[PDB]
Design a protein around this ligand. Structure first.
Ligand SMILES: O=C(O)C1(c2ccc(-c3cc(Cl)cc(Cl)c3)c(F)c2)CC1
Ligand SMILES: O=C(O)C1(c2ccc(-c3cc(Cl)cc(Cl)c3)c(F)c2)CC1
Lengths: 115, 116, 116, 115
């Protein structure tokens, strides 16, 4: 599991459950090619997006579908989605966790890059 | 104005208005002495807590009364308050802005320290 | 000034100075059209991106060039940029402040939306 | 495990390893009584602080020793420590996670309260 996403909800104080997450890779022509997607679990986590063989160096975009998340809870949100854009570099550690903390008018994101 | 506090509300997307703030300073006996207090304005800013003369070197605690803020909006939040504890002025007088971003179960704070 | 951007540096405890910002607007063909750009001042603020007349209703992307900021300070950061994507002015004209707090492997953003 | 603490480092993009964490309970006389303590693991987590029997309703303070953490990495920090103060309420969920994201001049904290 070289890429994991974990999402928390700062309003309810809970994992962000059943959030859609789409991952894209940047292609030669500067367009975003679908790469992986899924919905966060009851623990706010999304595992099994990719394999070591498929996850090569390059620029990736993780789009978190926050607007749908907030509307399903009856909450008025600001953002269309949260976007996390980063380069995967085989220099330094092998396992990427993208963590995000959601509020209706804010979000925070960090990277936990290990082993 | 060497100590200021700015607070934003991450649910409404707005300044956090009427947030009470209490500042304490660690005394010679290692207790927290009340130093200054105030509330955020319509802009989410709190000016005039202290003076350059009174804001001497020490360890300060800025307590932002987040529970009282959320309860006044009819929300039951997680935290009692947000605490920001730091040593001030140890390399000479500085101007400190303590900024905070509030949600019911979460907050962020940062410090902006400038040399006038 | 209906769209402003403020950026702080969580490592230095200081405004984030000379941060490039590019704003895009989604066009009729669903592509991102360049809308406006600028850089943060010595205060970490970017004023004068747009006008009330030009800042019409639409979906906007504010791209904060965090990688370029960190690399200019000699640091190799994680993210390419921070993106803030939102619908603006759908209930009439508003004033938007996009605030961001940067670290090498992390950022926070918030929006402050006011009705003049 | 009714109380867990998990700490991340926003400068290195890693768990915050070997951070000292002290938990206090507020006593009748408004003083802070030591309750539990430990050091975060290689995953940035601190498990086994308390038991269901010991963790009663009341006001708790979690002090994270950030200043020592940053100085051991050779980084100049702002805060003396990070402090998270909250009421434990048997109304609503049973398991508390205090999560924190550390920078030299900032920190973020959230609560994940589940089951
Ligand atoms: O003029 C502005 O926009 C200032 C500013 C700049 C950045 C922030 C900010 C603070 C936190 Cl704790 C988190 C975030 Cl995302 C922005 C903030 F609360 C306030 C100094 C108040
Ligand atoms: O495995 C994960 O995703 C966990 C996690 C998820 C998110 C955070 C976190 C906390 C804050 Cl205050 C801010 C951000 Cl972006 C992430 C965190 F500290 C820890 C639970 C450990």
């Amino acid at each position: 599991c070289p890429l994991m996403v974990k999402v928390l909800d700062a309003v309810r104080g809970s994992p962000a459950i059943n959030v859609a997450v789409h991952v894209f890779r940047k292609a030669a022509d500067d367009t975003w090619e679908p790469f992986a997607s899924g919905k966060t679990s009851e623990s706010g986590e999304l595992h099994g997006l990719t394999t070591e063989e498929e996850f090569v160096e390059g620029i990736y975009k993780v789009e978190i579908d926050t607007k749908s998340y907030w509307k399903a809870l009856g909450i008025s949100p600001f953002h269309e989605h949260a976007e996390v854009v980063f380069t995967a570099n085989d220099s330094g550690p092998r396992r990427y966790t993208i963590a995000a903390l959601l509020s209706p008018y804010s979000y925070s994101t960090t990277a936990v890059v290990t082993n």
